[PDB]
Amino acid sequence: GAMGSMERASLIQKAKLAEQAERYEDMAAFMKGAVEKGEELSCEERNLLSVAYKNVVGGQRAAWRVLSSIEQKSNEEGSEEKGPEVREYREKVETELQGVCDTVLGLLDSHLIKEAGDAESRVFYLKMKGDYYRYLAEVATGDDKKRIIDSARSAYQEAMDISKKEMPPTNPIRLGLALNFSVFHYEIANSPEEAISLAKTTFDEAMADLHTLSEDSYKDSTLIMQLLRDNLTLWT
Amino acid sequence: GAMGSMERASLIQKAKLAEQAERYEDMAAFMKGAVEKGEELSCEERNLLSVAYKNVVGGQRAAWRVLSSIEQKSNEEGSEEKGPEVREYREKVETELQGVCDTVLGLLDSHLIKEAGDAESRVFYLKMKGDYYRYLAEVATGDDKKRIIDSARSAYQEAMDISKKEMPPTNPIRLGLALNFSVFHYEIANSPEEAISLAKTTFDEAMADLHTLSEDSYKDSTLIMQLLRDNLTLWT
Numbered sequence A, B: 001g002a003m004g005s006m007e008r009a010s011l012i013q014k015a016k017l018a019e020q021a022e023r024y025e026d027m028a029a030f031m032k033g034a035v036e037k038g039e040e041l042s043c044e045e046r047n048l049l050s051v052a053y054k055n056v057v058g059g060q061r062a063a064w065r066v067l068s069s070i071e072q073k074s075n076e077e078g079s080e081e082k083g084p085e086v087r088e089y090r091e092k093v094e095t096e097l098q099g100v101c102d103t104v105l106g107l108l109d110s111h112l113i114k115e116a117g118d119a120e121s122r123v124f125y126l127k128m129k130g131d132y133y134r135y136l137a138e139v140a141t142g143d144d145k146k147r148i149i150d151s152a153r154s155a156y157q158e159a160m161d162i163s164k165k166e167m168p169p170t171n172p173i174r175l176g177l178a179l180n181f182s183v184f185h186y187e188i189a190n191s192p193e194e195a196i197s198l199a200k201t202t203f204d205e206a207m208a209d210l211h212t213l214s215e216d217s218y219k220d221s222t223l224i225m226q227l228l229r230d231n232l233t234l235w236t
């Protein structure tokens, strides 16, 4: 660990600076170093961890999709052989993306999830585990696609069960989990009906719980409810 | 050179793919590898080289400016001591930025400039040399600031002399060189009057040469003339 010699508090401070500078690779490395100090993460610290890797892998996924599209076009009828370069470079990006997902999943397994006892931390980390197996599933094609998909489903499902028992329907973590599990059903598991049912029931049950909330609360929950509505509008 | 085993043509192909995927670090590494094959670069290849490093260093500069601003605020009256972290992380970004500039300058010196005989290639590379010394000047503070500034001025000046002798006033490379030399005068050399004079004469002399051009030509020259006008509007 190249961050082993830096104070935990300094790593957190620098992660916040990297966020302000949109240096997300740095941000992720600082937060990895903070996790590796062995102490549990606070609510604010968990958000820094997830934002950093979301942006790193997000850029890798966007690049992979561009290259995969070029590759597919190059393998159609009437296309001129370009050689191995497109496949090679797509494989390079894919392998780097898989490495980042493996790193995140290793942090969750060593040892964030096992030490997370409160619902808000346990559901948060299990959602992340589902998210990063989902990203692996987006690029998987070999004899492991089915196992990767089931690993994502299993993590999302355990997070769902906890969130329904321990969190109100408007809790932003519960809402973001349901949004992403719904995307998993639609895009990964070939289950659009399940995706639509989950997004609708999640939206409706949150709607009916809004009356319990303060005003300047739940800006993140309003945002996420709109994303559920956006997906239902695209899917129906 | 980690690109030593890849074919030149494959490096160029992958640089174009990286551009489409907005993977500019990859793009720069592929183009560095292509330069290191020892053959001169075509017009299209020179553009790939400059776009790749422009985007890499551009992101580093934007991050450095964010951090430097935070650092300055932290060193004002009434500010709470945050410790060494802001300076440390600004120094980290600064050192990475300087390393990229050094790499580009080394490619120009080994051996792009010495083998560039045509005006369009020689002016192009000398403009790049001025640009990357300018980026070094933006962060320089020690006993080398003056020498760095003069290295930028010297490269821009030699490019200017060639461009005025060998290129029409509407040539896009000549125009972009004048635009950037004007920015050097304004932002680096504390010479706003020189910056304004250069931008105005460049604009006026290009205006008077437009009548020689074809229509679907010079989209890049129209774009650059507008940037000269934009700067004159900001500066006056």
Ligand SMILES: C=CC(C)(C)OC[C@H]1O[C@H](O[C@@H]2C3=C([C@H](C)COC(C)=O)C[C@H](O)[C@]3(C)/C=C3/[C@@H](COC)CC[C@H]3[C@@H](C)[C@H]2O)[C@H](O)[C@@H](OC(C)=O)[C@@H]1O
Pocket: A019, A047, A048, A050, A051, A054, A124, A125, A127, A128, A172, A173, A175, A176, A177, A219, A220, A221, A223, A224
């Ligand atoms: C990374 C730190 C920063 C940028 C400072 O904060 C990110 C954000 O962190 C919190 O928001 C979380 C959160 C996001 C909110 C939906 C953003 O809301 C607004 C108004 O922008 C998106 C972020 O990625 C983050 C951290 C992700 C999670 C997601 C994590 O799964 C493992 C589950 C849902 C969502 C929850 C955790 C949100 O509470 C806060 O409630 C947000 O504050 C506001 C104005 O709403 C803040 O923007």
Ligand SMILES: C=CC(C)(C)OC[C@H]1O[C@H](O[C@@H]2C3=C([C@H](C)COC(C)=O)C[C@H](O)[C@]3(C)/C=C3/[C@@H](COC)CC[C@H]3[C@@H](C)[C@H]2O)[C@H](O)[C@@H](OC(C)=O)[C@@H]1O
Pocket: B019, B047, B048, B050, B051, B054, B124, B125, B127, B128, B172, B173, B175, B176, B177, B219, B220, B221, B223, B224
């Ligand atoms: C990197 C390759 C790609 C993205 C394919 O092309 C970049 C661009 O490459 C060319 O444009 C150059 C060029 C740019 C043009 C001003 C862009 O014009 C338009 C319409 O977008 C900006 C680029 O950074 C680039 C390569 C940089 C230079 C600069 C280099 O200094 C060392 C000097 C001025 C300018 C010259 C070289 C331009 O000719 C072409 O003339 C442009 O084609 C069009 C539509 O105008 C193309 O967009």
Ligand SMILES: [Cl-]
Pocket: A088, A089, A092, B014
């Ligand atoms: Cl590759």
Ligand SMILES: [Cl-]
Pocket: A014, B088, B089, B092
């Ligand atoms: Cl640092």
Ligand SMILES: [Mg+2]
Pocket: A007, A008
């Ligand atoms: Mg300590």
Ligand SMILES: [Mg+2]
Pocket: A040, A115, A116, A117, A118
């Ligand atoms: Mg615990």
Ligand SMILES: [Mg+2]
Pocket: B007, B008
């Ligand atoms: Mg060869």
Ligand SMILES: [Mg+2]
Pocket: B040, B115, B116, B117, B118
């Ligand atoms: Mg030559």
